[model samples]
Target: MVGLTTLFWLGAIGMLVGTLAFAWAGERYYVTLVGISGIAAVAYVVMALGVGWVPVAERTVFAPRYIDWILTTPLIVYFLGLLAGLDSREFGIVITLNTVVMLAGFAGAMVPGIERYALFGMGAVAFLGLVYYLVGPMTESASQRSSGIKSLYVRLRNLTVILWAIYPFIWLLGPPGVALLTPTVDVALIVYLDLVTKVGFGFIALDAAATL
Candidate 1:
């Protein structure tokens, strides 16, 4: 019952360490990305604490988690945008659409009923569109850069695509559907995924940047 809180605490600490490591490990250009990640790690900590205070049955809206996503999701896309050598205008569009994906999910979480699932489905579609842009235009832009950079960019992009694709499936496990997993397992799953994608992804990106 209370295991989710423990998992969140562990996730927060992991993210904190990862943030510091990434912050100092890379070039100035990539620091913005790392810094944003650091900020997200802090947000995760806050979210963990917030989740602990709310009872499971009453937890309809994941306010802290969604708020973190709305803020940090764009920053992640922006990081990819930089690695992919996207211009500001193009990058802006990516961030905009990425924000939409987050907000849509947030809306879904806020609403109570079947409509929420539909919204979540719509969010998943938006996420796909966002991915299309990233894999298409962003990858193309990165291809124009140096070969080493392009390789790193492609790898990071592919990793993100794979990581992000799993999120919708996770959402399906909760709310507006029969929850197949217990709350503890569900929270653990989501936290671990975020740990890998956020912390692990940052480290990988830093390693790639180091080669340059």
Candidate 2:
């Protein structure tokens, strides 16, 4: 249990350091990175303390981390949208789908019975749309920019989709879906994933942003 808690604290420290680096990077517009890391840190602390959660469908659902996703994931989408040079309308579209995906997945995880499948079905469908824009129009938009930006976009975009792909898969394997992993092990995988997605991605995004 302490090991799991230690992972949470590791996420917190990783985010704190990410925040400082992003802040000092001096990209005023990219303060999105700064906020993302700090928000992630807050969720990490909340998860570590074992508060801001609930018993969902006979299992623990950490609402704070989901809240963090609801808040942070879209910002990352917004960042990529910026990188891809998406129009305002497209930005609205993608960010909305991003939120829906997060909400749907979380709702699916929380509820029991057929509603879980229903929400998962809905989320999976929405996820298709979210994925479409990133791999489709967004990447296309990146090509219109300099080759440097396009290459960078490929890395950032690929990183995003690859990391994000795991969330739903883990749900499918964990108690909420198939019940293969113990709660301790299930959350252990998610904790490390969070650090990489939030902290690791933060640094990579900012580091790339500096070049553009």
Candidate 3:
């Protein structure tokens, strides 16, 4: 079941990448990769379930934990670059705070569940405030803002930060033993959070860009 699911995802990802590549450039490699991967993935998925992941919750099968980090880290760094380009002081403050929060988060992982929750909650509140209060009002208008200059950076930053926000919750809040034992849920939750954060940060980035 897992092997088949893996193939399915690989194929899906390839197709999505191919589609994006096609939209951007007449890239045939992406399409070929997509076709090869997608067909193989779909076939494997069919062999496993005979239907598809339609009946399965993504959380049950996505294996998002490490993958989430892998995909999001670069994006977060990119976002930081955007922030720096826009307002170095603001970006510095936010990044410093984020660094501290991440340190606390690592500490939180070693503590008890309740403590983890408390630290994570506090960190979440602080980060959200940073995004809305500090980062929010700084956006400039057409005459001042340069979305194109920092768009990718914003995306990467948001994506990475979202992953950071998510992993702890899954590790600390969900079934205590499940994250360690079965482990599937751990990955699913992170991926789910990744998607959510990407959407949210994207929105914030666009809004901020407009103001800049």
lDDT of 1 at 193: 80
Q: Summarize candidate 2's per-residue lDDT along 1-212 as a digit string, tens digits.
A: 35667877777887888888878876334588887888998998888897876887677777888899999999888878887888899999998898888998888878877678889888888888998999999998988998987887788788889988888888888877887887778887887887787778777766766676
Number of the top-ranking candidate, with TM-score as the measure:
2
lDDT of 1 by residue, 9-58 (tens): 78778878887787666544456666656666776677677752433344
Better by lDDT, candidate 3 or 1: 1
Lowest-scoring 10 consecutive residues by lDDT in candidate 1? 52-61
lDDT of each: 0.74, 0.82, 0.44
Relative to the true structure, candidate 3 reaches a TM of 0.44
List the candidates' TM-scores in order: 0.89, 0.92, 0.44
Off by over 4 Å in 2: 27-29, 209-212
Q: Candidate 3 on 14-58: residue-level lDDT in tens?
A: 434433433343213323323322343334334335352221221
* Residue 52 lDDT, candidate 2, scale 0-100: 72
- The regions of model 3 sitting more than 4 angstroms off are 3-84, 133-135, 141-143, 146-172, 176-182, 192-212
Sort all candidates by TM-score, best to worst: 2, 1, 3
Least lDDT summed over 10 consecutive residues: which range in candidate 3?
A: 54-63
RMSD per candidate (Å) reads: 2.3, 1.7, 10.1
